Structure 1
Amino acid sequence: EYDPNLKSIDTPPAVSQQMFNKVKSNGLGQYAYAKGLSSKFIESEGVKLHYVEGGSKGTPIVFIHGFGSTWKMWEPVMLSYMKDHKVIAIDLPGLGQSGPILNDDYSAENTSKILIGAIKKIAGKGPIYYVSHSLGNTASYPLVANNQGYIKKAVFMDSPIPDRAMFEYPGYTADGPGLGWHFGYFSFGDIAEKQIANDPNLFFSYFIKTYAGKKEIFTPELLAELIEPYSTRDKLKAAFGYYRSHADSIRQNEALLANGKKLTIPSMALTGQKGVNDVLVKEMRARFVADPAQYTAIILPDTGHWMVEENAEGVEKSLSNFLF
């Protein structure tokens, strides 16, 4: 929730860059994976994807991060599940250590095409469970909707799936900046890319803390680890490509919804009370589920947008109860 008293940092960009360098050179943040996990790369449709996996036996679980995150956001859950499950977290095209989509088509259909080809190779013949967060929800709906069966169950976390309401979210509210404003700023030419690349730490420290419920978790070192992956123009260009492509993704998802392809597999909207809250919950119920008997909605209390950082226990309990 917007906090009018939150201060932005005044760290000089040069000092922040030293922090980012230290993260990479010391193999921290997105480059750090715990015992049991392996970092790999795979080519899909000419795009080199980075992923991390663990486990072997048991229904595979594929985790797709979003904006401000990489695969790394899933590490605690992956470690928790790897004893019983193959666990796979993939960096979204262009983000983390995955290469960019060079024709700039970051629409839901294109990213879904890229992801599914990789998933089929890494996860195998299935079925699998599919867990998505933030921009993962933008990248993934066609993938999930067109692969029900191979996807046995699916979870979308906090952020809305692109639909007609994305043309409606307000830029401003009685509480200050609204859900809609970043969809505009991030698709406003290359301005966000250029402005944020000048001082990624400044923008993201404020941005990340703003949507956190538990702000104290986000120490400067943790913030550096989180922001390093988004510290260059190429990574910001890729991230904001998702936003430029939203009108496309909306048209694509609206077509799926109208042309049969609602969800007939069990699905869950899992959100943070202090994050995006009830938007995804209402959205999926009203528009995305064929039978509400298969739909679970859970809003974690006192939890912001960064759900695994702030409430890994709540995320894990919700996923376990729903998936297994």
Structure 2
Amino acid sequence: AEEFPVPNGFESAYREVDGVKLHYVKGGQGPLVMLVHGFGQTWYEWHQLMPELAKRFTVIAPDLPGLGQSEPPKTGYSGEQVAVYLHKLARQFSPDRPFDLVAHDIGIWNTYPMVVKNQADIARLVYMQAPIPDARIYRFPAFTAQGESLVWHFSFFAADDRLAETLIAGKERFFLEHFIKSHASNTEVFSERLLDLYARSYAKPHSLNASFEYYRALNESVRQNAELAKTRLQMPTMTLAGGGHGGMGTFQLEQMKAYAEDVEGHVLPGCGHWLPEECAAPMNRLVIDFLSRGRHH
């Protein structure tokens, strides 16, 4: 069974990595690019970008441990632990050459440790729409002059007593529509049909729990990254952020400058958090162009 339709010419498959069965969708030929999704979504957020990239690259889009059709991690949900699964998965398909990385939201959290610890394996890097876990996340406001703040969900999802699962179980479709649209500028792209697909996936009990375990490990990830960030990233990097409602704005690039020697950033106007869907044409163009500066098929 497939939770989301696989694009023509791609394969849906699984690979055991350190005892954990990871789901991924793969296609194309050439150097490897791995695309890593974020909270509320699965590999499918990349499904419009993947066919274009696959004209030049081998493209792999995994489901994060516990999300989509991937089994939960056996070690833990901190960024350093999850990054091991993703690094090993990529190196199964690119064992002798560096690969490219694109990551969205908690995809960043779950890849930054393996990037900084294996810099020679990463040719080019694209990060969009979330802070790298560090002390900056403690400076975001709980409440703003407009209302809902961007990341009050950090506390909701991290709270003990399984607060978030207990309140959201049975209401997953309602909650995800609210979460997604409240973080969007171009809300109309989230049709009821698309929301149904995403909600069905993360309503699996182990996926609802896995979703929030990433946030329960967020302070551990911060502590990990305080050590790791003593080495700056040396490979070409690009950041993307939305400039509209739900977007990180200038924060994305300004934080990345503390992490990377070679970084260019873009803020996409009229786009919120969900760049692949809200602003597919300019986001796809920026990613394809940036990755095609390196050698490709």
Same fold flag (TM > 0.5): yes
Task: Please identify the structure whose Cα radius of gyration is greater.
Answer: 1
Q: Percent identity?
A: 36
Deviations 1:203-224 (A, max 9, x none): 1111111111111111111110
Amino acid at match of 1:269: T
1:75 to 38, 41, 47: 47
1:200 to 156, 172, 183: 172
Q: Distance in 2 between matches of 1:244 and 1:194?
A: 15
Give unpaired runs (5+ residues) of structure 1.
1-23
Q: Distance in 2 between matches of 1:123 and 1:185?
A: 38
Amino acid at match of 1:68: G
Query: Cα offset for 1:233?
Result: 2.4
Q: Distance in 1 between matches of 2:179 and 2:276?
A: 17
1:39 to 12, 16, 38: 12
Q: Distance in 1 between matches of 2:220 and 2:288?
A: 34
Check whether the contact 1:60–1:86 (CA below 8 A) recurs between aligned residues.
yes
Check whether the contact 2:17–2:85 (CA below 8 A) recurs between aligned residues.
yes
TM-score, normalised to structure 2, is 0.94
Amino acid at match of 1:81: L
Q: Name segments (4+ residues, structure 1) moved above 4 Å.
A: none
Amino acid at match of 2:49: V
The count of residues paired between Structure 1 and Structure 2 equals 289
Q: CA RMSD in A?
A: 1.3
Structure 2 partner of 1:220: 192
Task: Say whether residues 1:267 and 2:240 are aligned partners.
Answer: no
Structure 2 partner of 1:3: none
Deviations 1:213-264 (A, max 9, x none): 1111111111101211111321111011110000110111111112xx2111
Check whether the contact 2:4–2:197 (CA below 8 A) recurs between aligned residues.
no
Aligned partner of residue 169 in structure 2, secondary structure: helix
What pairs up with 1:232-271 in 2 under 5 angstroms?
A: 232-258=204-230, 261-271=231-241
Structure 2 partner of 1:303: 271
Structure 2 partner of 1:21: none
Deviations 1:249-306 (A, max 9, x none): 0111111112xx2111111111111222222221111x212x2xx2110111111111
Check whether the contact 2:150–2:183 (CA below 8 A) recurs between aligned residues.
no
Query: Cα offset for 1:102?
Result: 4.2
Amino acid at match of 2:238: M
* Structure ranking higher in helix proportion: 1
Check whether the contact 1:68–1:230 (CA below 8 A) recurs between aligned residues.
yes
Structure 2 partner of 1:146: 117
Deviations 1:177-196 (A, max 9, x none): 21231110001121101211
Task: Say whether residues 1:134 and 2:115 are aligned partners.
Answer: no
1:86 to 35, 38, 58: 58
Query: Cα offset for 1:123?
Result: 3.3
Check whether the contact 1:172–1:180 (CA below 8 A) recurs between aligned residues.
no
